[PDB]
Write a protein that binds this ligand. Structure first.
Ligand SMILES: O=C(NCC(F)(F)F)N1CCN(C(=O)c2ccco2)CC1
Length: 119
C-alpha cells in the first residue's frame, strides 16, 4: 500500500527497456533528414528519454500518466510505419508486449495503494 512505490518501479522498468535492443529507435527524437515526413504523420513525439526525464523531474503524478506517454511511443510507431511487417514497427510491438507485461503490476499496486489510502 506504498503510494510512492510506482516511481522506482517505473525507473527500474525503464532501465530494462533501455537495455533491450528493441528500444534503440525509441530512445531519442526522429532526425527529419532521415525521416522527412515524420512530423507530417506524427503531431506528438514521444521517446523513452523524454519519459525517463519527465519521471526523474517529478512531473508524473501517477504511473497511469507515464503509461499514457509510453503508449504514445508505440501508437506513433504504428501510425508512422509503412507496413505492419516493418523492422522498427516489429520492434515496437515486442517492446510494447514487454512493457504491458511489466507495467500491469505497477498500475495494480498503485491503484490498490490509493484505494487503501481513501478507505
Ligand atoms: O528515427 C527514429 N528514432 C530515432 C533514432 F533513430 F535515433 F533512434 N525513429 C523511431 C520512430 N519511428 C518509427 O516508429 C517507425 C516506424 C516504422 C519506421 O519507423 C521512425 C524512426
Amino acid at each position: 500500500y506504498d503510494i510512492q512505490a510506482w516511481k522506482k518501479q517505473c525507473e527500474e522498468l525503464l532501465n530494462l527497456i533501455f537495455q533491450c535492443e528493441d528500444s534503440e529507435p525509441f530512445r531519442q527524437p526522429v532526425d527529419l533528414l532521415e525521416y522527412p515526413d515524420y512530423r507530417d504523420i506524427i503531431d506528438t513525439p514521444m521517446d523513452f528519454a523524454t519519459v525517463r526525464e519527465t519521471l526523474e523531474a517529478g512531473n508524473y503524478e501517477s504511473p497511469m500518466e507515464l503509461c499514457k506517454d509510453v503508449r504514445l511511443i508505440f501508437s506513433n510507431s504504428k501510425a508512422y510505419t509503412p507496413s505492419k511487417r516493418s523492422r522498427i514497427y516489429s520492434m515496437s510491438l515486442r517492446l510494447s508486449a514487454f512493457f504491458e507485461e511489466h507495467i500491469s503490476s505497477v498500475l495494480s499496486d498503485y491503484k490498490s495503494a490509493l484505494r487503501f489510502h481513501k478507505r
